[PDB]
């Protein structure tokens, strides 16, 4: 296991498409909970946010939400499975940019959006993908794509790694590989965010 305390605002974006079974989705949410504990959201150092995205964006936890750990883990665990036909990564990103990271009430902590993707949105919806990804950059928001399975929008994952250097991506064959390279994902975040006290 890998744990660490750091100044961070981490946003979990979860693919709500039918490319993942309900049961698989339950594994994805379990990964989010572990992540919350690993980064220790129990401290005022890390702020977490959780958004599920299919046609639209569904936020169950906001960064400035003031609730105790046990409560947040619950919400995260209760995020509803959508099993939707469409999961627009451009929508959730547009949402992250305008509705989550609009301002910078913490120019000290790192801002990271972990975009857990398992599908490929229709091209007709990706007209402003790069525009939004670029916007996130202008606001010091690092986007880390996590391709899950064979249907992850690889063109977009590449396009994200490209827009910024620190935008490193992870590719897992299935949600089961999640808990596999978790330490690897956590380790990379502790190297991106400034330190906090234990």
């Amino acid at each position: 296991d890998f744990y660490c305390s750091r100044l961070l605002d981490l946003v979990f974006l979860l693919d709500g498409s039918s490319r993942l079974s309900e049961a698989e989705f339950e594994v994805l949410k379990a990964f989010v909970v572990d992540m919350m504990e690993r980064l220790r959201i129990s401290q005022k150092w890390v702020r977490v946010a959780v958004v599920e995205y299919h046609d639209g964006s569904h936020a169950y936890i906001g960064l400035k939400d003031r609730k105790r750990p046990s409560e947040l883990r619950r919400i995260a665990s209760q995020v509803k499975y959508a099993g939707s036909q469409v999961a627009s990564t451009s929508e959730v990103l547009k949402y992250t940019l305008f509705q989550i990271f609009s301002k910078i009430d913490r120019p000290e902590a790192s801002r990271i959006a972990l975009l857990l993707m398992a599908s490929q949105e229709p091209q007709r919806m990706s007209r402003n993908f790069v525009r939004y990804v670029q916007g996130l950059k202008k606001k010091k928001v690092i986007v880390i794509p996590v391709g899950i399975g064979p249907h992850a929008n690889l063109k977009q994952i590449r396009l994200i790694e490209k827009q910024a250097p620190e935008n490193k991506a992870f590719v897992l064959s299935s949600v089961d590989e999640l808990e596999q390279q978790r330490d690897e994902i956590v380790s990379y975040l502790c190297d991106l965010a400034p330190e906090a006290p234990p």
Binding site: D55, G56, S102, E108
Partner: protein, 265 residues
Amino acid sequence: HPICEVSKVASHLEVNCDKRDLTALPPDLPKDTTILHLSENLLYTFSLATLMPYTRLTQLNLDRCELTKLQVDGTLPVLGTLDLSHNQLQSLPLLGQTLPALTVLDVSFNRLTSLPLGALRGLGELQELYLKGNELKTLPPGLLTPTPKLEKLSLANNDLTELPAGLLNGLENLDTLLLQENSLYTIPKGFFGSHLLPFAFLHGNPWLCNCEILYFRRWLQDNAENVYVWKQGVDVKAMTSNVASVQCDNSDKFPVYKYPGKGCP
């Protein structure tokens, strides 16, 4: 402090006095306090002057209390965030002269039945304004002239019957406009101008589809992907792109964006 929780996070000093059954501001709060949470307490009245000692305060939360009166005295030159939502205030406070640096104002779910002329004078740094869940029927002209930098405006769930034709003028940075769940039946011609508007919620309204709704319809077709639906649920708050939510008579039987208007010039 023996009443509230204090925790310094970098260059910020946060004081949490959430749900402490407080009936008045706790005395002897750290002098460097930059963020104060007084939400969900038993405060029937509050005076801003009592915070002057904290020359570092930048955020103040007085939401979900029992506020029936708010005194606007002295000045908190560094405060940019004020949450007054979920109280019993019967009128909008005039803060332009007491809160110069204000960037976010929330007075949602109170008892506002109108907004005063020149209500936001002096609030030139205001970027966000939430007035959701009150009883506004109409808005005064020039309401947002003083706040040119506005990015997010919410008037959702009031009882608005119409909007001033020039309401959004000068707002070249507006990205979120929430006007859902009101009593609107038409949009004045040229209302939106040429400015791009990332998020606009227009559902829950009795749109009167006739020749006059044509301006709105052309706007809708050109902005189908910027028209959103706001859904609320248990722990979940969603925003979904869907132009068809905007409909005639408020019935899904016919979207406004696809209204013919046979003989309209």
